[PDB]
Design a binder for this molecule. Structure first.
Ligand SMILES: [Zn+2]
Lengths: 52, 42
């Protein structure tokens, strides 16, 4: 789903008015949920999110 | 005295900022039940 969404959107050239800037998007990757604690990374569970 | 979650350790923390379990990382604590007499009518 997300790959088709990002592939359908086409970013054209950006010109304020020679130099020009163009952007592109590659493969979309999604990682598993992880709690960013102050000490170290911890496993994230639905009940942890419900209680916090 | 507070009991942690997946980790078994007595917190016993009463400070306002102390909310994180020691040497555990998780911030979920359960209040422990002390030895108090309670009367119920059957
Ligand atoms: Zn703990």
């Amino acid at each position: 789903g997300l790959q088709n969404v990002f592939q359908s959107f086409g970013e054209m050239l950006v010109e304020p008015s020679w130099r020009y800037a163009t952007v592109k998007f590659g493969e979309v990757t999604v990682e598993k949920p992880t709690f960013f604690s102050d000490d170290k990374e911890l496993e994230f569970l639905p009940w942890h999110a419900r209680l916090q | 005295t507070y009991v942690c979650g997946d980790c078994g350790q007595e917190n016993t923390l009463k400070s306002g900022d102390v909310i994180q379990c020691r040497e555990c990382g998780y911030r979920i604590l359960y209040k422990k039940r002390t030895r108090r007499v309670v009367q119920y009518e059957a």
